[PDB]
Amino acid sequence: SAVKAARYGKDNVRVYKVHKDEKTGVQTVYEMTVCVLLEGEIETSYTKADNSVIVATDSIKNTIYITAKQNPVTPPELFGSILGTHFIEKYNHIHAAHVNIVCHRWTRMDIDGKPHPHSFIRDSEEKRNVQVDVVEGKGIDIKSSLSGLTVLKSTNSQFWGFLRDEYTTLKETWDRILSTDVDATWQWKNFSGLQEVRSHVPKFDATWATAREVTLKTFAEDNSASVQATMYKMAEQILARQQLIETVEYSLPNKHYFEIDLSWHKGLQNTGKNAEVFAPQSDPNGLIKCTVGRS
Amino acid sequence: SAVKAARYGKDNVRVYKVHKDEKTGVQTVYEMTVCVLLEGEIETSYTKADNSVIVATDSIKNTIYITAKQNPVTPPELFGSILGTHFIEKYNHIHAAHVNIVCHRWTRMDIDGKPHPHSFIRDSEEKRNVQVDVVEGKGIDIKSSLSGLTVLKSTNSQFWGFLRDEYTTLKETWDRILSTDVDATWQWKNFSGLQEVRSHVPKFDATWATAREVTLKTFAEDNSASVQATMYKMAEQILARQQLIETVEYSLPNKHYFEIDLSWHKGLQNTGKNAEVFAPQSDPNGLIKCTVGRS
Amino acid sequence: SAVKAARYGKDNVRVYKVHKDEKTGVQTVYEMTVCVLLEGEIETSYTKADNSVIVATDSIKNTIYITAKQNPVTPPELFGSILGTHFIEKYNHIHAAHVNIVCHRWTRMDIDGKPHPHSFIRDSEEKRNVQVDVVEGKGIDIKSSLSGLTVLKSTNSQFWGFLRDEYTTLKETWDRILSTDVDATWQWKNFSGLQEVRSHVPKFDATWATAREVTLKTFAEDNSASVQATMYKMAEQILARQQLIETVEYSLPNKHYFEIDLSWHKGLQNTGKNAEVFAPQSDPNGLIKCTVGRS
Amino acid sequence: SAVKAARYGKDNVRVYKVHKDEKTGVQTVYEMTVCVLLEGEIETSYTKADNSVIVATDSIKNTIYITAKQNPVTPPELFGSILGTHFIEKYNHIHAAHVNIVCHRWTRMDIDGKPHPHSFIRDSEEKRNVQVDVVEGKGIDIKSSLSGLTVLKSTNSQFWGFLRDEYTTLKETWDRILSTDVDATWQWKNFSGLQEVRSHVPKFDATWATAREVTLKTFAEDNSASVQATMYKMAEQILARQQLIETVEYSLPNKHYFEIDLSWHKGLQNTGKNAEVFAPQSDPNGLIKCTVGRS
Ligand SMILES: O=c1[nH]c(=O)c2nn[nH]c2[nH]1
Ligand SMILES: O=c1[nH]c(=O)c2nn[nH]c2[nH]1
Ligand SMILES: O=c1[nH]c(=O)c2nn[nH]c2[nH]1
Ligand SMILES: O=c1[nH]c(=O)c2nn[nH]c2[nH]1
């Protein structure tokens, strides 16, 4: 037998960093969870028990803390690029590094209408993520994403005109609830290395903001024909507004809310136009995915 | 053997309700998870296999939906009181009802600086809860709470002067990070029944708001001597501002963030006044509880 | 305002211990999660910021490891008694200790029909737990439990003859699936202190085994009239077989499996006697509780 | 913009099936969670709001239940093949179906040394999974796996001789604890269609059993030089024992158990050869992956 592929590293590395503006006394905090996996000429650790080629995963953990101490940790696209470049430049036999970063929200508190200098709240479980693949001789590939963004609209969603056959029991509707957890990923054009990533630093936060704003406004304003059609509208605008993006991917569950017929009880009317009380369903759920690119 | 205590019912009942203002076109949504347990003269279902005394748990589920269709579901203290009173008034052999309600956040979206008429976001995993115990001949006991409120301050927290003996390794500090998940419960004076609960309806949302505001402002502004001392300050103000509350209970984990000594690596300075990168600890955690009442 | 109650300590302390039989080379492992909360004359830490009365929670953590190094950690009723007695004997102003222990399964592997000397498998998520309250001048109160034991029987469960009124839609049945997660707690007679707990050490594992065996055999062999009736049978036998137990408490969800009517599709028969494919329901669920004692 | 890829369907479909041997009265149960995603000529649902090409996800759910009613559901490789073939044969514009199945354990209870006819226990959270991709004109690709298998050995694991540089603090060791959660996947040679899958039905359960046995025996008996080296030994044997497998993939966390130095307390000895009490670490964790194929 032979080794066809192999990677190894450290997962679930939690990191916090604080920035303190000595002048204003204002502090800013960052918290993330980091995963780093390495690839290279490491097959003999598997086949011959030769540990000499292994950078210990404990050392990878150390490296993450040291890099965060000596560099900016925002935007995460920059920090991930710096960290993966380190490993392939530092170790001759390591030729690829895969860095995943999850950013956790710590939003500044407003007290008495004024923003507080050093207190924060986790105002949501929504994440900002990056996946950075650094490959020797092939540059830096970055996928940026937002995940965990949970929304609901109580009207202005429709679903009619779908295929009907002998497996079909679902009724057409012109007014329904639509709720989803948004997972959206934008993939950047390949970058030749760290200098190029640094030259675009301003676009990373602005594009994350645009992606969020467009997702929110399109969900609220689209009189939706389907999940499929609404998500395509989001992806299109984002591509239109940032030319360095090559593809946009959306993955959207359809979290169903079912009507409850109460007519068995004293003729109570709770369906169609009289629907007021609904049963959220934990499972199963629709799952709809799309990758949109340039034509 | 004998039955010394017994209760039974339905848990994890998910409910959504929408309100539609025909005039303005503005819609408002409510989502909760409900648990209802009953007590009464039901021992023979356990000892004699006599199911005649059992209100089926499926029927309890139905009752929750019907009650939500016919009554307001906010504030949750009112809805829980109405639902538990129904069971003890409707069934002669049922003498107590225990109703737990978890309210989930659906916050109105602002689009282009304007509040949207029918789109919402789960802006946090924080919950608003109630526990309502309705007991025949003994009125209605309500405990209201907020839970899941996650906060952090990066400075203005201290912990020195604690007991030191041969089990002690912790060092005193005058500047540390404090992070917690707030669980706060305020217990109302007993109410004689539904009419009295209805007469106080306005105080329920205002007190929840006060409890939140006081928790947030005290956490941000207190130069904290300990978790114990800061939480006592919160409980005291709340009691001072709502006379119908009898006790306030706080339960606060201390989620530790540890310094990381990097001096082994090129003399890097990352402790004490140079501390910038920290390691969040998943476990173990301090747990500190207090119940405060009137003197 | 005044402090009416207060406790504080360390939660989520993970502990592993290994025992090595030098003679046979056989090793045995134990893993648990420990919570210790203290009560006493500690109110001024809350009201006056006096940390002098506080045993730091970090010190409590240390104490747990040291105690495990110097004493047996099985049965958990003994280890919890030893640990809580330490705190009230060691600190004059601490008058109660609350110790919760969760035991995780590490079951010896059988390889080639022979039990392996040092390899283990987590053969289930079922836990063995203890709650030990040690109170100065009032002895040691122990509640032992098993939790997470998940079972299902595909026939020989019934539910008919329950109350029917205008809230009722559930149909009577003489053959249904019954599935639950067992939570069972047996409460021991108060013990005067450590010497008495030690004199009964053999009964702790034997009673846990009995409780398990009786739970399993009664569930499998009872032609169940209801959850209520079957759980009473379990509690009764346990009380009959261990006289040092004062009460037995069971808490049992009814995890529903619903029939699926497929007759809309080519007259397919899948209900009643032809029921073969069912839909497990994640929520809601029945919840049935009973505490049984001696008459 | 253009659609570059798209798939949609139903996730988290829970299914139970019972088999009843009329002759012996013995019953056997199966429970699984199913995900089915479809691909095809469906782009206009995204770009033109044309729902005519959509098979509703509710209909997919129905199809899963009907297929389970009319066919065997074991082994899961067969059931997944049957279900994905249905969709591409039934709908002309659907050209690929992706079926994921998770099998949950329901193990027959032994009562009084005898196997019970209709009672079961979830004896572990370990899963048996399949991923089946059915593609029009390209046959059936099956990946089978076991996941959630949690093990620990308390000795006969080593880790020395790894790379040491200025990022390294980890010490070499010749005796450590090794614990992991096993994720193992074996990929079958492509099959031309259902008849070929049916001709190999006996190999599916036997290979799952072999994969399990080899994983367990190698973990227990290997005096491990590293996670990398031990997992390669497992993959090699499996390939040696089933020629229809093309690749074997392992993904193994290294769940660390750290020594605790207690010497600060009365010279207590708890490290190296005196190590008895350890601290399980929840995070971070090593992550080691390997794909092994034929040479
Ligand atoms: O938006 C929707 N898309 C779908 O594909 C679907 N199928 N069922 N309901 C649905 N709603
Ligand atoms: O606020 C705190 N309270 C405590 O009781 C404690 N113990 N350790 N650290 C602590 N911090
Ligand atoms: O065993 C049962 N007990 C109950 O109380 C019940 N209510 N609905 N179904 C039930 N089954
Ligand atoms: O088995 C191991 N493999 C590794 O790659 C490693 N790195 N640190 N510890 C380790 N143990």
- Dihedral of CA atoms C145, C150, C154, C159 in degrees, nearest 10, equals 50
Taken as a whole, chain B contains a residue count of 295
DSSP assignment of D183-232 equals: EEEEEEPPBSSHHHHHHTHHHHHHHHHHHHHHHHHHHHH--BS-HHHHHH
Report how far residue A184's alpha carbon sits from residue A235's, in angstroms, rounded to the nearest whole number: 9
- Structure tokens of C35? 């919570």
Taken as a whole, chain D contains a residue count of 295
How buried is residue D112: exposed, middle or buried, by Cβ count under 10 Å (0-12/13-18/19+)? exposed
- Residues D130 and D187 sit within 8 Å (Cβ to Cβ): no
Question: Degrees (nearest 5) of the Cα angle D168, D170, D175?
Answer: 150
Tokens 């919890």, residue?
A: C80
* 3-class DSSP state of B282: coil
> B117: cis peptide before it, omega within 30°?
no
Question: Degrees (nearest 5) of the Cα angle A150, A152, A158?
Answer: 130
A162 φψ region: left (φ > 0), alpha (ψ -120 to 50), beta (else): beta
- Structure tokens of A293? 């690119």
Report how far residue B43's alpha carbon sits from residue C291's, in angstroms, rounded to the nearest whole number: 11
Whether D150 contacts chain C with CB within 8 A: yes
One-letter identity of residue B47 = T
Report how far residue B47's alpha carbon sits from residue C230's, in angstroms, rounded to the nearest whole number: 9
Whether D283 contacts chain B with CB within 8 A: yes
Report how far residue D98's alpha carbon sits from residue C170's, in angstroms, rounded to the nearest whole number: 37
Query: Crossing angle, helix C57-70 and helix C76-90, to 10 degrees?
Result: 130
Domain that holds residue A263: 2-295
Helix intervals (H) in chain C: 43-47, 57-70, 76-90, 194-199, 201-221, 227-241
Helix intervals (H) in A22-147: 43-47, 57-70, 76-90
- What are chain B's partners, defined as 3 or more CB pairs within 8 angstroms? A, C, D
User: Which ligand lies nearest to the CA atom of residue C253 in the structure?
Assistant: 3
Name residues 168-187 of chain C within 8 A of A (Cβ): 169
* 3-class DSSP state of A87: helix
Nearest residue to D54 (alpha-carbon basis) of A172, A151, A220:
A172
Chain D residues with beta carbon closer than 8 angstroms to that of A290: 3, 5-6, 46
Breaks (C-N over 2.5 A) in chain C follow: none
Helix intervals (H) in B201-269: 201-221, 227-241
- Residues C269 and D10 sit within 8 Å (Cβ to Cβ): no
Tokens 């040690």, residue?
A: C134
- Structure tokens of C139? 């002895």
- Structure tokens of A209? 């903001």
CATH of the domain at D48: 3.10.270.10
- Residues C235 and C218 sit within 8 Å (Cβ to Cβ): no
Question: Is position C86 annotated as part of the catalytic site?
Answer: no
One-letter identity of residue C198 = R
Nearest residue to A245 (alpha-carbon basis) of A127, A143, A100, A133:
A143
* 3-class DSSP state of C232: helix
Count structural domains, chain C.
1
- Structure tokens of C47? 């009201």
- Residue D139, number of CB atoms within 10 A of its CB: 17
How buried is residue D26: exposed, middle or buried, by Cβ count under 10 Å (0-12/13-18/19+)? middle
- Please name the member of B264, B265, B282 whose beta carbon is closest to the beta carbon of D282: B282
User: Active site residue: A33, A44, A57, A210, which one?
Assistant: A57
B17 φψ region: left (φ > 0), alpha (ψ -120 to 50), beta (else): beta
Give the list of residues 6+ apart from residue A273 with CB closer than 8 angstroms, or none.
none
- The CA distance from B286 to the nearest CA of chain D, in Å, is 16
**Is beta strand A94-104 parallel, antiparallel or unpaired with respect to D94-104?**
unpaired
**DSSP code for B170:** P
Q: How far is the CA of A205 from the centre of ligand 1 (A)?
A: 33
How buried is residue C170: exposed, middle or buried, by Cβ count under 10 Å (0-12/13-18/19+)? middle
In order of A103, B150, B184, C13, the CA distances from B181 in angstroms are 19, 4, 10, 18
Report how far residue D54's alpha carbon sits from residue A163's, in angstroms, rounded to the nearest whole number: 6
- Residues B201 and B137 sit within 8 Å (Cβ to Cβ): no
* Distance from the Cα of residue A166 to its chain's centroid: 39
* 3-class DSSP state of B259: strand
Question: Is position D90 annotated as part of the catalytic site?
Answer: no
Q: For residue B90, give the H/E element and its range.
A: helix B76-90
- Structure tokens of C126? 């079922």
- Residues D252 and D186 sit within 8 Å (Cβ to Cβ): no
How buried is residue B147: exposed, middle or buried, by Cβ count under 10 Å (0-12/13-18/19+)? middle
* 3-class DSSP state of D45: helix
Give the list of residues 6+ apart from residue D16 with CB closer than 8 angstroms, or none.
C177, C257, C277, C278, C279, C280, D29, D30, D31
In order of B216, C212, C247, the CA distances from C216 in angstroms are 50, 6, 19
Cα within 13 Å of Cα(A233), Cβ side: 20
Q: Is A45 in the pocket of ligand 1 (CB under 6 A)?
A: no
Contact D216 C121 (CB under 8 A): yes
DSSP assignment of D103-160 equals: EEP-EEEEETTEEEEEEEE---S-EEEEEEEEETTTEEEEEEEEEEEEEEESSSB-B-
In order of B61, B101, B103, B252, the CA distances from B130 in angstroms are 18, 5, 9, 19
Question: Is position A116 annotated as part of the catalytic site?
Answer: no
Report how far residue C138's alpha carbon sits from residue B261's, in angstroms, rounded to the nearest whole number: 46
Report how far residue C64's alpha carbon sits from residue B140's, in angstroms, rounded to the nearest whole number: 42
Question: Degrees (nearest 5) of the Cα angle A29, B159, B155?
Answer: 20
- Residue D275, number of CB atoms within 10 A of its CB: 17
Nearest residue to A104 (alpha-carbon basis) of A178, A42, A163, A16:
A16
- Residues A98 and A206 sit within 8 Å (Cβ to Cβ): no
Tokens 């020989």, residue?
A: C156
Beta bridge partners of A110: A115
- Resolution in Å, one decimal, please: 1.8
Give the list of residues 6+ apart from residue C22 with CB closer than 8 angstroms, or none.
none
Nearest residue to A66 (alpha-carbon basis) of B282, D165, B152, D160:
D165
- The CA distance from B114 to the nearest CA of chain C, in Å, is 37
Beta strands (DSSP E) in A79-121 are: 94-104, 107-111, 114-121
**Is beta strand A114-121 parallel, antiparallel or unpaired with respect to A127-135?**
unpaired
- Structure tokens of D264? 């600060």
Using the CB atoms, write b or e for A213-231: b if 16+ within 10 Å.
Answer: ebbbbbbbbbebbbbbbbb
